[PDB]
């Protein structure tokens, strides 16, 4: 299972 | 044995040809279990191994939504990377990400990973401590500052020590038939005269899983690292892998050479010779 890494560069 | 779960993202811009393509493949060890492709007719997370199909409709929904949100995230990353490197909008560029966890035989976290690359060069990577980052350059240092401010390492750590190992645990149980079975290599030595006074001895390993293997030649019990032609381990397409190593030897000297084979499906290393 993945998780949401919502933060961008 | 020890096991790993990894997700691999590729995000590729293609000016003039639509929005950047986003692809995710997930692996347990050398087994692909899940894929997502933004270019698919109806993009969603798709099962690639039988043992993942038992995951319920909600799993696939949740996983699909992650990938769909990621499609947008990585398209922004590509635009941002363009700015940070003062690059034109005319070129094609690639971001890659690999992340996940290794666990030991007892199912406990050995270590976590979360690494990004831009155009094949290191960009930013979570350190082994799961608490800090390594930025490859002054562009990645901007992202680092950003992720420090938003405490991103804390969130990765939470995933890596929890859901990553928990889901991996569960996948290994569900796919124990295959994921927890090592297939030893089938091995043989072939003999090919190159010319009157030189012959090729090729040591073959076929049908093995997982991919990690060591094939070496010795001459009078001494490693022939420099004289050995070693091909890259390659997939057969039936889940298993193949490799060979070749040495060129003087005619009549074949018996001085031994092939040595290490693989986790083997109780002890194997020693092989040309068998006339």
């Amino acid at each position: 299972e993945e998780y949401l890494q919502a933060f961008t560069y | 044995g020890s096991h790993s779960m990894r997700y691999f993202y590729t995000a590729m811009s293609r000016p003039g040809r639509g929005e950047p393509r986003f692809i995710t493949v997930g692996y347990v060890d050398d087994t692909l279990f899940v894929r997502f492709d933004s270019d698919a007719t109806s993009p969603r997370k798709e099962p690639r191994a039988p043992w993942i199909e038992q995951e319920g409709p909600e799993y696939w929904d949740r996983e699909t939504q992650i990938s769909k949100t990621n499609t947008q995230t990585y398209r922004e990353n590509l635009r941002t990377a363009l700015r940070y490197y003062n690059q034109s909008e005319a070129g094609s560029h690639i971001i890659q990400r690999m992340y996940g966890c290794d666990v030991g035989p007892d199912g406990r976290l050995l270590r976590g990973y979360d690494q990004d690359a831009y155009d094949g060069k290191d960009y930013i990577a979570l350190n082994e401590d799961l608490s800090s980052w390594t930025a490859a350059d002054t562009a990645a240092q901007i992202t680092q500052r950003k992720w420090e401010a938003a405490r991103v390492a804390e969130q990765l750590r939470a995933y890596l020590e929890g859901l990553c190992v928990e889901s991996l645990r569960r996948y290994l149980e569900n796919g124990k038939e295959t994921l927890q079975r090592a297939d030893p290599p089938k091995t043989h030595v072939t003999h090919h005269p190159i010319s009157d006074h030189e012959v090729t001895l090729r040591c073959w390993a076929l049908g093995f899983y997982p991919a990690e293997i060591t094939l070496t030649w010795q001459r009078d019990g001494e490693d022939q690292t420099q004289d050995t032609e070693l091909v890259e381990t390659r997939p057969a397409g039936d889940r298993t892998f193949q490799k060979w190593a070749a040495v060129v030897v003087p005619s009549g000297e074949e018996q001085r050479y031994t092939c040595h084979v290490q693989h986790e499906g083997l109780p002890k290393p194997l020693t092989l010779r040309w068998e006339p």
Binding site: - | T10, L32, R48, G120, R202, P235, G237
Partner: protein, 99 residues
């Protein structure tokens, strides 16, 4: 900046004439991800060849497997033909059952 593909052409199982098998072209170590790969039978492109989903190694370089069912014979010649931004013309690699 750019990395040229390594190319291997080989069968899934040991080659035996008249026995159906799978012909593989494994392309690896390349960057960027765009690549053109044909499997050839006596010089002519085989139709409906399939490939694996795009992935990459710990060094970030990409790899793909292209594959087609085939029944080898003594006289039919097989090859992979690969094009990549790094290559000025397509590279042809001949199938050799001993490699």
């Amino acid at each position: 900046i750019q990395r040229t593909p390594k190319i291997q052409v080989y069968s899934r199982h040991p080659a035996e004439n008249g026995k159906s098998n799978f012909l593989n072209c494994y392309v690896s170590g390349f960057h960027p991800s765009d690549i053109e790969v044909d499997l050839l039978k006596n010089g002519e492109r085989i139709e409906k060849v399939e490939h694996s989903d795009l992935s990459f190694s710990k060094d970030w370089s990409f790899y793909l497997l292209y594959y087609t069912e085939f029944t080898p014979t003594e006289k039919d010649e097989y090859a992979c033909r690969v094009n990549h931004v790094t290559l000025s013309q397509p590279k042809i690699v001949k199938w050799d059952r001993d490699m």
